[PDB]
């Protein structure tokens, strides 16, 4: 029967499932694309005039009240006095630029610094008298006198916007409000200051802060846990939504990029600095050989290298994801007992310390167990072909395990392995060799190998689980 090691792989491959024909939390479950469409329901966007396919938008930080601040009721209904005006502080301006950068990273927009004043296509400013919310912005379908404007609440009762920083609510709010100015809405028909909106009023299940920064609702609603942290940058569904409007940015991080620990992203939200770092990000990456490095964590982690998939990283749940259309090649686990699932291409998987379960998937994968009793799992024959097999780079006999219990020939076929020196034309015959080693199995029974695994360090029959 199927081993527990295989079961854990299969369960995490289908973890945080979306789509499907059943109601989730009393809502229909949406795919990433369906969620993106709903986010863009207002059909609001900036029109490309200087050049198509690439948009250029200027931004500035107001130094004095504008015409809208002075008399809001002349322009908008149900907004009267915004209180005291204050310019964006030095910290606010630097964090706004990082929020702006995180948007331009993922889509074809170039943000130009227009300095201090009312110059920019997008403007930023603080207000003190709340209109039911912590901040507000206008979508780009409004008249020119309001287009691009975002406003943020600062008073003695609300201080979240005063000191924005990586992982806090002040930063997310900035990313959220700029999202509005670019043309994104809340994933549901709800608004702060209007009645009593809850997660029950969402249009779809994946309307949480695990999938979109435009959402009001906490990640716990869809089974995630960020332990108090907020996403600083666009999440899975945000990326899909904004790319529908202004395209995918295929110039971003085209070289070999490391995410998590030892990061070369130069992005605070993509980077881990200590064993306590609370990571929340969705990877947008245009090309190259890329690595998820979570070696500095001690907790038991679950890492999924497939696109659109969510991972459990550094004591958090469903906090790391990979954007649609992104290929990430490599994963490095921490000192805890980790689960590492690869994707369709060639993957380098490193477990590190602890008892790790590695699943290369399709392609010829380089699998490092590290210290401890590690399990290398196979669910399909095509995952390690005789012509292009996996390599187990640090296999230790009597400690590590080759798991084949999930294979169709064992679960349903009822096949028993016969270890031999030559294939006589029988199903299940296996040749185990050593010099460096190799395991080659003839599952069909045509005297030719259809499944193989390359070995660095010898393996025995006892190291193979069926």
């Amino acid at each position: 029967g199927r081993s527990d090691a295989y079961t854990q792989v299969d369960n995490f491959l289908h973890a945080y499932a979306r789509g499907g024909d059943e109601l989730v939390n009393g809502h229909p479950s949406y795919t990433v694309d369906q969620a993106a469409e709903q986010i863009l329901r207002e059909q609001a966007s900036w029109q490309k005039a200087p050049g198509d396919s690439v948009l250029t938008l200027s931004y500035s930080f107001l130094t004095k009240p504008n015409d809208f601040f002075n008399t809001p009721w002349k322009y908008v209904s149900d907004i009267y006095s915004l209180g005291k005006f204050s310019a964006f502080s030095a910290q606010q301006q630097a964090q706004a630029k990082l929020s702006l950068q995180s948007w331009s990273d993922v889509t074809n927009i170039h943000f130009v610094d227009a300095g201090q004043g009312d110059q920019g296509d997008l403007t930023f400013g603080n207000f003190s008298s709340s209109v039911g919310g912590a901040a507000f912005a206008f979508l780009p379908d409004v008249p020119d006198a309001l287009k691009g404007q975002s406003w943020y609440l600062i008073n003695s009762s609300y201080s979240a916007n005063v000191n924005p920083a990586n992982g806090n609510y002040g930063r997310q709010t900035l990313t959220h409000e700029i999202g509005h100015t670019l043309g994104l809405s809340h994933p549901g028909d709800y608004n702060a200051g209007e009645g009593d909106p809850t997660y029950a009023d969402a249009t779809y299940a994946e309307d949480t802060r695990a999938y979109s920064v435009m959402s009001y609702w906490e990640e716990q609603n869809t089974g995630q846990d960020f332990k108090g942290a907020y996403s600083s940058a666009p999440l899975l569904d945000d990326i899909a939504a904004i790319q529908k409007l202004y395209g995918a940015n295929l110039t971003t991080r085209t070289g070999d990029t490391v995410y998590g620990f030892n990061s070369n992203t130069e992005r605070d939200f993509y980077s881990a600095t200590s064993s306590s770092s609370k990571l929340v990000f969705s990877v947008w990456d245009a090309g190259g050989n890329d690595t998820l490095d979570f070696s500095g964590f001690s907790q038991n982690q679950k890492i999924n290298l497939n696109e659109k998939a969510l991972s459990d990283v550094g004591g958090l749940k469903g906090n790391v994801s990979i954007a649609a259309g992104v290929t990430v090649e490599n994963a490095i686990g921490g000192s805890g007992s980790d689960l590492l699932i690869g994707n369709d291409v060639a993957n380098v998987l490193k477990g590190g310390a602890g008892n790790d379960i590695l699943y290369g998937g399709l392609g010829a994968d380089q699998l490092w167990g590290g210290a401890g009793a590690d399990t290398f799992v196979y669910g399909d024959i095509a995952e390690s072909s005789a012509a292009a097999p996996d390599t187990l780079r640090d296999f230790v006999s009597g400690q590590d395990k080759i798991d084949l219990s999930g294979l169709d020939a064992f679960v349903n076929g009822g096949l028993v392995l016969q270890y031999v020196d030559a294939f006589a034309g029988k199903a299940g015959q296996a040749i185990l060799s050593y010099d460096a080693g190799s395991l080659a199995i003839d599952f069909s029974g045509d005297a030719h190998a259809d499944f193989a695994i390359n070995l660095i360090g010898q393996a025995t029959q006892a190291d193979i689980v069926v």
């Binding site: 908008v76 209904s77 039911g132 919310g133 507000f136 206008f138 979508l139 409000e177 509005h180 608004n191």
Partner: peptide, 6 residues
């Protein structure tokens, strides 16, 4: 006429 945040 705008779109507040929670």
């Amino acid at each position: 006429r705008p779109k507040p945040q929670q």
